Amino acid sequence: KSYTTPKKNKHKRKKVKLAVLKYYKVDENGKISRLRRECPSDECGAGVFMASHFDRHYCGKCCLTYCF
Amino acid sequence: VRHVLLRQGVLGIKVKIMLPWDPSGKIGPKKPLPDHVSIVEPKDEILPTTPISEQKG
Amino acid sequence: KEWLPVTKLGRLVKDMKIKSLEEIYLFSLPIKESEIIDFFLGASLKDEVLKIMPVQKQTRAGQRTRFKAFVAIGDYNGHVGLGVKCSKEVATAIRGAIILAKLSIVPVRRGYWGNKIGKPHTVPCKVTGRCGSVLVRLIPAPRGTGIVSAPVPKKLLMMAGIDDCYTSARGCTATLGNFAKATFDAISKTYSYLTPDLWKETVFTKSPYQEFTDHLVKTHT
RNA sequence: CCGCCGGGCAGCUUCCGGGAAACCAAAGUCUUUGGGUUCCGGGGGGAGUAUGGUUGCAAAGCUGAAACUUAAAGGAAUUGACGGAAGGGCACCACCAGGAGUGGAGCCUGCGGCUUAAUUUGACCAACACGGGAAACCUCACCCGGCCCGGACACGGACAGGAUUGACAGAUUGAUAGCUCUUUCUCGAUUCCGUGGGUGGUGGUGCAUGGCCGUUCUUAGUUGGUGGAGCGAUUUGUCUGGUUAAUUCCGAUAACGAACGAGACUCUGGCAUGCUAACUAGUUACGCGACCCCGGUCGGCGUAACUUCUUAGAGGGACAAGUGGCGUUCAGCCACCCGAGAUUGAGCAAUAACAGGUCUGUGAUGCCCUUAGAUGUCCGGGGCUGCACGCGCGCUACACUGACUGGCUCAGCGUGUGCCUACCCUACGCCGGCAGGCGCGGGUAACCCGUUGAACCCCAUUCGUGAUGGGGAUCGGGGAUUGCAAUUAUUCCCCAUGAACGAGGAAUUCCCAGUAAGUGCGGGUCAUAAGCUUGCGUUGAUUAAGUCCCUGCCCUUUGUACACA
Ligand SMILES: [Mg+2]
Ligand SMILES: [Mg+2]
Ligand SMILES: [Mg+2]
Ligand SMILES: [Mg+2]
Ligand SMILES: [Mg+2]
Ligand SMILES: [Mg+2]
Ligand SMILES: [Mg+2]
Ligand SMILES: [Mg+2]
Ligand SMILES: [Mg+2]
Ligand SMILES: [Mg+2]
Ligand SMILES: [Mg+2]
Ligand SMILES: [Mg+2]
Ligand SMILES: [Mg+2]
Ligand SMILES: [Mg+2]
Ligand SMILES: [Mg+2]
Ligand SMILES: [Mg+2]
Ligand SMILES: [Mg+2]
Ligand SMILES: [Mg+2]
Ligand SMILES: [Mg+2]
Ligand SMILES: [Mg+2]
Ligand SMILES: [Zn+2]
């Protein structure tokens, strides 16, 4: 009826952007390099980028990992 | 036997209706009550006091 | 819905051969049907529920409560009845008390105090009513005194139309049933008192049962 | 002997009348209040107490307060309840005659207690093998840790210049939970951060409730309408008597007509050589086939009749009908013939109720609880099983009326492949001593398991009165089966181990005809599975056809200072 242990957060989505700032680099002219490494995945060849989290290496959607 | 919800509590209602007897069976039941002997009343005919015949054809 | 009458006096009064209930009071016939009274008096006959009294007998499992209602009815000119009815629920006790009170309307003699100008106002003499232990004494009064009483004989006298009266009660008047039907007994025997203007020896009239004995052969057997 | 008169104790009857009523020819002639006159009461207690007077030899008597305390004390009558009050009757939840026992022993299970992180909890005749409560996980509520949100919606923040969804590494953890710390990737308006506000609980409260059940209460009891009595609560009907299992009837009668309960009913048990019919049941004949010395056996094969057996529908049948007694000669009872039965057994079952049980059956539920650090839910582990003790329900026993080992020969209830649901009943053939394992098959079922080849029983062996071949508790080891997982042995098997127990103290439970009891087989529980419970057959008695003595129940009368009785 009337509850004992009450709610905290759920598991969130996300607002402070242009997260693409930190994968691509340009100069003032036609020069397009990339900060972060590209996924060799079979489902997506060149679109999906690998990861920057918190120690090592990884990618997210097919979740395939690169380490030392 | 059905419930009523209230602000104060819960109420219960039993409605029990004894249906009347009918030969049709669309209003109530077909069978009479097992202790209801309904005799038929005799139609009244006179006894004849002289033997008479009924020839014809 | 219609009133199919059972008794003989009721058959006459719905066949409209009795002019008013004063002649069935004259012959003192037993009224045992309630429709007679709100036939002659149904316009102005008012009711009061004096009290709802919950008596209870005691059975094997618990206590068997039955409500007993007191209903005093009467038009405000010359008639009162007092009905007492015990039943399981208060509504049907009240309805049965109304039909007993209509059954037991008794006509009210009321007369004067001193000089006899006008329309009568008090009881004709000093009368008493006793039942249980309570004695209720009704006394003539000058005009405009009002009824001086308790609320219950106050209300039965004012619906008798005794619009002024001096009352004195003795006994255990707290018991409402005895106090009410004692008051009704005093109002009732106002006519049974023998007053000196009633010494003309009575020219006896035809009885209703005798005067309409051919109609009472024809219209039902 | 029959009257009359006066007064005397009385009585009966009565709508004189009176009274709160019991009642009373006075307790009447009282509010319609007055014949005459003494004595005396003023709520209940304190109290006929103290003190004073007076009397007495004394005990004591007459006069006789107050302080103080108290909301009732009391009278008459009604209805219940109660009675170690009476009169009738009734029941193996009572007794008698008995039978099987229980209580004694081991063990199974529930309960109190003890112990513990927890050993959750409901209930103490009418709780205690009850919650369909036989819990390894789930159940699960309890305990110890860890995830998730399963914050709907609205308002305002910050806001496709992305609040961080999910996340293998590696630390941490129990866990390959990204739960959280050290590359911030993929995802792309779902949503959060405050704010209100819902939602969920096997949390509390059955003493807020419904519903359902149990019980008072398995007995015969209960209530209106009108009429009678009484001021009234109430009573009458609903009863003297007989009779019945029965407030069941005959019948009496200020009651008449009615309703519920009993009965009636419904299912079941029993009887049909008459009906209806049967390749999902059979019988008999017939023809083959097998066997034995024309015949006999065959659940061997196939079909010409029939429905006795079996299935199951309509009917039928038994009604105290008939006879002899008993009784108002009514209601009915007893006996006997005829006969399948001359009381089979159950289900439903009233008015009024208990603060009986259930919020732990529910999305039936009022109110209250607690505002991440779950009493929601999920997962991992434990516990619900813990053992100095006491109790209840039960199983096995204490042997020869037996055990063991062969052999022989008989049932009826039923159930069976699932919505999720992934787990069914199993014949037959191989392997293994058993537990079981492996193959192919039948069955959504009168088809297959299945002619259900069940036990006890019966027959034949061994045992020999010895805690013995009774008993099988406890306990070591090994093998199987279900399961994600068996340790606190889940269950089954094999071997070995062999406790108490010599018929149970006071006390006590159930029962009377296919009944008690012995004996196994089905259902529920169930993945595994019955020492329970619900059903079922099988073998089948002793005693009794009665009583109120005990325990209680019903009706009448009477008594009450009882009425949470
Ligand atoms: Mg006086
Ligand atoms: Mg006094
Ligand atoms: Mg009293
Ligand atoms: Mg008996
Ligand atoms: Mg005995
Ligand atoms: Mg014991
Ligand atoms: Mg024992
Ligand atoms: Mg178990
Ligand atoms: Mg568990
Ligand atoms: Mg758990
Ligand atoms: Mg709930
Ligand atoms: Mg209760
Ligand atoms: Mg209670
Ligand atoms: Mg609190
Ligand atoms: Mg338990
Ligand atoms: Mg042995
Ligand atoms: Mg031995
Ligand atoms: Mg007993
Ligand atoms: Mg059980
Ligand atoms: Mg006495
Ligand atoms: Zn990738």
Curated annotation (Swiss-Prot), chain A:
The modification N6-acetyllysine is found at K22, K31. There is a cross-link at K25, K31 (Glycyl lysine isopeptide (Lys-Gly) (interchain with G-Cter in ubiquitin)). A zinc finger (C4-type) spans 39-62. Monoubiquitinated at Lys-25 and Lys-31 by RNF25 in response to ribosome collisions (ribosome stalling): ubiquitination promotes subsequent activation of RNF14, leading to EEF1A1 ubiquitination and degradation and rescue of stalled ribosomes. Deubiquitination at Lys-31 by USP16 is required for maturation of the 40S ribosomal complex. It is found in: Cytoplasm; Nucleus, Nucleolus. Residues 1-13 are annotated as: Disordered. Component of the 40S subunit of the ribosome. Part of the small subunit (SSU) processome, first precursor of the small eukaryotic ribosomal subunit. During the assembly of the SSU processome in the nucleolus, many ribosome biogenesis factors, an RNA chaperone and ribosomal proteins associate with the nascent pre-rRNA and work in concert to generate RNA folding, modifications, rearrangements and cleavage as well as targeted degradation of pre-ribosomal RNA by the RNA exosome. Part of the 40S ribosomal subunit. Part of the small subunit (SSU) processome, composed of more than 70 proteins and the RNA chaperone small nucleolar RNA (snoRNA) U3. This is Small ribosomal subunit protein eS31. It comes from Oryctolagus cuniculus. The chain holds residues 83 to 150 of 156 of the full protein.
